[PDB]
Amino acid sequence: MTHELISLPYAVDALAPVISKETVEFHHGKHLKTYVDNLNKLIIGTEFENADLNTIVQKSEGGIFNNAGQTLNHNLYFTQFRPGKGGAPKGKLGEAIDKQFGSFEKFKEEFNTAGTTLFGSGWVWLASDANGKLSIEKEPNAGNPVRKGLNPLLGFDVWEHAYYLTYQNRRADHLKDLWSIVDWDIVESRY
Amino acid sequence: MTHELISLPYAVDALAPVISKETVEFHHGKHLKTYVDNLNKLIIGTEFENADLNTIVQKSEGGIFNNAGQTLNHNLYFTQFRPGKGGAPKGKLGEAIDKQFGSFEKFKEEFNTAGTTLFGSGWVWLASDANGKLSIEKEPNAGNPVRKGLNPLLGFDVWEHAYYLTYQNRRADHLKDLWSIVDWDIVESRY
Amino acid sequence: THELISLPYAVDALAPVISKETVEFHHGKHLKTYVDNLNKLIIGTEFENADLNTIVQKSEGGIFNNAGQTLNHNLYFTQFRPGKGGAPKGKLGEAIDKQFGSFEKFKEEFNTAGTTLFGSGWVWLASDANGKLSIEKEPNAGNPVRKGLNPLLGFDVWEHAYYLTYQNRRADHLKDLWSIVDWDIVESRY
Amino acid sequence: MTHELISLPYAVDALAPVISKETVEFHHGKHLKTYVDNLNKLIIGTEFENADLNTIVQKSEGGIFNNAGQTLNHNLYFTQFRPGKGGAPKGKLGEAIDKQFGSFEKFKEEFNTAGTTLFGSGWVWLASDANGKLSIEKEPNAGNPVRKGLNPLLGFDVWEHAYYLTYQNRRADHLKDLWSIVDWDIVESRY
Ligand SMILES: [Fe+3]
Ligand SMILES: [Fe+3]
Ligand SMILES: [Fe+3]
Ligand SMILES: [Fe+3]
Numbered sequence: 155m156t157h158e159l160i161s162l163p164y165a166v167d168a169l170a171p172v173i174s175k176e177t178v179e180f181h182h183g184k185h186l187k188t189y190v191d192n193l194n195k196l197i198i199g200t201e202f203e204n205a206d207l208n209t210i211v212q213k214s215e216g217g218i219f220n221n222a223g224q225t226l227n228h229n230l231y232f233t234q235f236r237p238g239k240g241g242a243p244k245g246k247l248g249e250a251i252d253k254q255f256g257s258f259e260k261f262k263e264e265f266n267t268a269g270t271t272l273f274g275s276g277w278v279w280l281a282s283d284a285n286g287k288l289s290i291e292k293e294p295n296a297g298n299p300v301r302k303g304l305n306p307l308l309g310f311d312v313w314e315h316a317y318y319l320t321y322q323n324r325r326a327d328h329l330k331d332l333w334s335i336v337d338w339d340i341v342e343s344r345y
Numbered sequence: 346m347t348h349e350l351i352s353l354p355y356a357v358d359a360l361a362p363v364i365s366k367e368t369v370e371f372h373h374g375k376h377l378k379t380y381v382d383n384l385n386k387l388i389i390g391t392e393f394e395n396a397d398l399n400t401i402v403q404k405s406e407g408g409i410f411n412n413a414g415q416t417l418n419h420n421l422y423f424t425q426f427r428p429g430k431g432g433a434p435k436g437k438l439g440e441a442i443d444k445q446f447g448s449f450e451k452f453k454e455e456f457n458t459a460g461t462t463l464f465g466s467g468w469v470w471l472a473s474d475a476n477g478k479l480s481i482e483k484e485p486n487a488g489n490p491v492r493k494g495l496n497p498l499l500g501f502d503v504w505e506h507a508y509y510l511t512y513q514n515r516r517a518d519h520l521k522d523l524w525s526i527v528d529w530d531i532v533e534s535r536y
Numbered sequence: 537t538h539e540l541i542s543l544p545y546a547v548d549a550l551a552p553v554i555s556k557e558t559v560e561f562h563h564g565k566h567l568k569t570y571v572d573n574l575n576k577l578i579i580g581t582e583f584e585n586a587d588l589n590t591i592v593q594k595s596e597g598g599i600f601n602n603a604g605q606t607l608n609h610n611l612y613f614t615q616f617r618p619g620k621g622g623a624p625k626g627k628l629g630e631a632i633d634k635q636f637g638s639f640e641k642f643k644e645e646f647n648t649a650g651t652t653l654f655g656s657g658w659v660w661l662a663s664d665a666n667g668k669l670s671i672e673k674e675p676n677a678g679n680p681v682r683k684g685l686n687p688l689l690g691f692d693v694w695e696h697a698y699y700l701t702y703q704n705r706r707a708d709h710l711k712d713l714w715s716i717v718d719w720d721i722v723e724s725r726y
Numbered sequence: 727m728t729h730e731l732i733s734l735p736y737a738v739d740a741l742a743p744v745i746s747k748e749t750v751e752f753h754h755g756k757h758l759k760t761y762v763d764n765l766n767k768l769i770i771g772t773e774f775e776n777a778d779l780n781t782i783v784q785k786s787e788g789g790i791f792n793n794a795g796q797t798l799n800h801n802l803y804f805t806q807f808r809p810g811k812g813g814a815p816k817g818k819l820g821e822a823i824d825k826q827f828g829s830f831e832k833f834k835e836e837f838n839t840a841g842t843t844l845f846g847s848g849w850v851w852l853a854s855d856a857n858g859k860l861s862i863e864k865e866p867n868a869g870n871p872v873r874k875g876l877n878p879l880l881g882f883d884v885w886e887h888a889y890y891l892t893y894q895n896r897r898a899d900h901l902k903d904l905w906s907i908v909d910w911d912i913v914e915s916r917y
Contacts, residue, residue: 170431171363171525184895220845237429273792274847274867274885295846313846314886315895320522321362323756323887331361334428375704411654464601465656465676466695486655505656505695506704514565514696 155197155204159190160229168237172331174320185315186228193221211300223296227277231309236337243338246286247307247345254288266329268292269312278329280308282345307344308336346395350381351420359428363522368510376506377419384412402491414487418468422502427528434529437477438498438536445479453524456501459483460520466504470497473536498535499527538588540571541610549618553712555701566696567609574602592681604677608658611725612692617718624719627667628688628726635669643714649673650691650710661689663726688725689717727776731762732801740809744903746892757887758800765793783872795868799849802916803881808909815910819879819917822860834905840864841884841901852880854917879916880908 162182167175193210196218197203202210207229210222242258243251255261269278272292279291281299288307291299299306310332317328353373358366384401387409388394393401398420401413433449434442446452459481460469470482472490479498482490490497501523508519543563548556574591577599578584583591588610591603623639624632636642649671650659660672662680669688672680680687691713698709734754739747765782768790769775774782779801782794814830815823827833833852841850844864851863853871863871871878882904889900 167432168429171428171522172361174525180894188895276846315890318887318890319894322752322891323760324362327362327365331358334358334361371703379704467655506699509696509699510703513561513700514569 156194157190157207157225159187160232162232164236169235169335171320172328172335173235173317177316177319180319181315182228182232186225186232189221189224189228193218193225196221208300211298212303220296223298223301226298226300226306227296227309227311230306231311234308234337234340235335236340237335239337239339240334241338243342245342247338247342250282250286250288250345262330262333265290265310266326269310269329270326272312275313278310278312279306281306286345305344308341346397348381348384348398348416350378351423354424355427360426360526362511363519363526364426364507365511368507371510372506373419373423377416377423380412380415380419384409384416387412399491402489403494411487414489414492417491417497418487418489418500418502421497422500425499425528425531426526427531428526430528430530431525432529434533436533436536438529438533441473441477441479441536456481457517457520460501460503461517463503469501469503471499472497477536496535499532537575538571538606540568541613543613545616545618550616550716552701553709553716554616554698558698558700561700562692562696563609563613567606567613570602570605570609574599574606577602589681592679593684601677604679604682607681608677608679608690608692611687612690615689615718615721616716617721618716620718620720621715622719624723626723628719628723631663631667631669631726646671646691647707647710650693651707653693656694659691659693660687662687667726686725689722727778728766729762729779729797731759732804734804736807736809741807741907743892744900744907745807745888749888749891752891753883753888754800754804758797758804761793761796761800765790765797768793780872783870784875792868795870795873798872798878799868799870799881799883802878803883806880806909806912807907808912809907811909811911812906813910815914817914817917818858819914820910822854822858822917826860837862837882838898838901841882842898844884847885850882850884851878853878858917877916880913 162178166178166182169178173181197205197210200218202214202218202222205213207222207226210218211226214222242248248258251258251261255264265278265280268290272278272294274294276292276294277297279293279299280288281291281302281304282288283304289304291297291302291304293299298309310329312325312329314325317325321328350373353369357369360369364372388396388401391409393405393409393413396404398413398417401409402417405413433439439449442449442452446455456469456471463469463483463485466486468484468488470484470490472480472482472493472495474480474495480495482488482493482495484490489500501520503516503520508516512519540563543559547559550559554562578591581599583595583599583603586594588603588607592600592607595603623629629639632639632642636645646659646661653659653673653675656676658674658678660674660680662670662672662683662685664670664685670685672683672685674680679690691710693706693710698706702709731754734750738750738754741750745753769777769782772790774786774790779794779798782790783798786794814820820830823830823833827836837850837852840862844850844866846866848864848866849869851865851871853861853863853874853876855861855876861876863869863874863876865871870881882901884897884901889897893900
């Protein structure tokens with residue numbers, strides 16, 4: 155079986171200046187493309203050869219997991235952003251964030267802090283369980299909450315390639331700027 | 346007339362990371378407010394009391410010119426930017442830039458270079474004469490091309506307060522980044 | 537070949553008037569550049585082996601900009617010391633007093649001059665041959681030695697000198713500077 | 727004790743193009759400075775306030791360890807390079823390599839492979855034990871062989887910030903180019 159490189163729902167420069175055209179090209183066209191190609195080559199002749207992506211992330215180990223996890227991570231990452239959006243979440247998700255975190259602003263800083271204190275490469279995930287309970291997951295390297303049976307809602311990539319060309323060492327500034335391009339209509343639909 | 350501090354056509358954090366929320370707050374909320382306040386003070390009891398800003402900039406000198414010039418400069422500066430824009434110019438302007446500079450990319454390095462070589466405080470302006478001929482004007486301090494009878498189209502502020510909080514001494518990096526927030530629709534409309 | 541002067545104090549010694557981050561950028565990046573540029577530009581010119589003062593006195597354009605800024609900062613950074621301030625004594629103390637009326641009066645005029653300078657520049661306290669004092673407003677890279685005067689005390693009003701801590705509050709910064717001025721060093725220049 | 731930011735034994739642009747002037751400015755001037763500043767702040771009032779770097783790396787945990795390990799890692803990193811060097815090792819070290827590795831070229835490929843396959847952020851270290859035995863240690867994130875009682879000889883930084891501005895995703899290319907700027911006289915002196 156074969157996994158495909160996702161098509162971006164927007165132009166490569168649609169997310170500037172928070173995510174530059176150059177970053178999109180490298181992040182999507184080089185990094186993600188590599189994870190997809192690796193995954194495809196590594197699952198041949200294995201029990202994951204014909205499994206759906208989520209099943210692979212939940213059960214694989216080693217190189218297969220690293221590539222499958224990164225593939226799922228970026229697929230979700232790239233499709234949750236849209237220019238001219240941002241703002242705050244409404245409806246179901248919006249209510250749960252206030253109840254569990256007190257307010258959207260309070261949740262944002264906890265999210266940002268989680269992403270900033272994650273040492274090295276990794277991901278910060280907003281996830282939920284079957285009951286709708288929200289949690290903030292700090293996932294080192296290729297980690298994803300589906301491995302814990304959780305539902306990944308919003309993920310911020312803190313691997314340096316996600317922001318280096320524009321922010322260099324200023325990861326904190328990048329995380330606070332990312333909220334401006336989050337399409338909550340897409341995120342709410344994952345809840 | 347009473348010159349007013351213009352309202353921003355976007356949110357204070359809309360131009361991050363090229364121009365951060367803090368910088369917009371000080372640049373617009375503090376520096377520009379001071380120029381407007383000083384201008385309103387100095388023209389009292391003078392031939393400029395009831396003149397429009399453009400006339401003041403073309404005919405004044407000394408303190409009146411310094412504040413009038415900075416007011417006009419910043420009013421044009423802040424209104425020319427937008428997030429999710431950038432790119433290249435189109436229409437006659439884009440056409441004129443190619444015809445007169447060879448290409449947009451050549452225009453940029455030439456504009457960037459003028460900005461980086463300006464010693465001290467100043468502005469670099471893309472201006473047009475009555476026939477649509479373009480020129481790059483290096484303006485020390487509060488200078489503006491309208492003083493030469495030209496039409497100011499796009500201006501980059503290289504006073505250190507425009508980029509210090511984020512870039513410190515790296516003026517060149519700041520200039521390179523500015524292109525990503527230029528709303529060419531607005532600039533084309535001035536042509 | 538000119539060198540980047542060595543600070544006679546720790547980088548965080550002048551905080552908060554001049555923060556640790558500012559000293560690092562002002563001295564470690566800005567001054568270094570003016571020096572690296574001055575060395576480069578004078579190579580193969582009549583100023584290749586002249587002394588800094590003569591360069592600032594005869595230079596033009598690029599060479600002068602970097603020369604004036606190097607001399608300017610050299611006197612700037614070396615005129616401060618933590619826990620000093622106060623008032624001037626001896627010769628200079630009497631001069632200022634006689635020529636300005638009082639020290640408070642002088643500080644006032646000096647602050648106004650610095651707040652008034654539009655754009656980038658330096659406000660300088662200079663002295664002529666007969667020890668007559670004058671407050672010189674120098675745009676950009678200017679320095680009183682150009683006019684054949686003796687530079688005693690200079691405040692850097694380029695925005696990079698205070699923006700990290702004071703942003704647009706230049707006046708507040710100039711009022712605070714007096715607290716870290718080492719008058720003993722200023723007297724030694726008069 | 728207050729740890730200092732090490733002085734570079736060469737110009738900031740001496741290592742270009744393998745390590746650009748900008749990468750040195752960001753890598754040494756921003757990343758290393760932050761790790762040092764952070765370390766100095768965290769150790770105050772702790773059992774490590776007066777301890778030497780190696781001791782801190784060997785016994786500390788959490789944030790102190792992360793910053794101390796990165797400080798030690800980078801100090802050895804920046805000092806082992808010199809323009810106009812490279813080549814192969816000689817002496818007791820050049821001998822030990824050829825011996826337990828086959829040849830310098832065979833050690834190189836092995837080292838390169840270690841660095842390219844380390845997933846996420848980390849360091850690849852050539853370490854020596856008490857008897858002079860050589861080993862290639864893959865250290866994730868802030869790891870250093872000193873923590874294991876070994877002697878660090880040559881370390882390549884594979885955190886993306888070490889090569890992204892110039893190589894972007896091409897880590898393998900960067901590791902290949904690193905050999906050209908290694909000063910074996912320095913390395914040899916550590917054995
Ligand atoms: Fe990524
Ligand atoms: Fe400005
Ligand atoms: Fe300065
Ligand atoms: Fe590093």
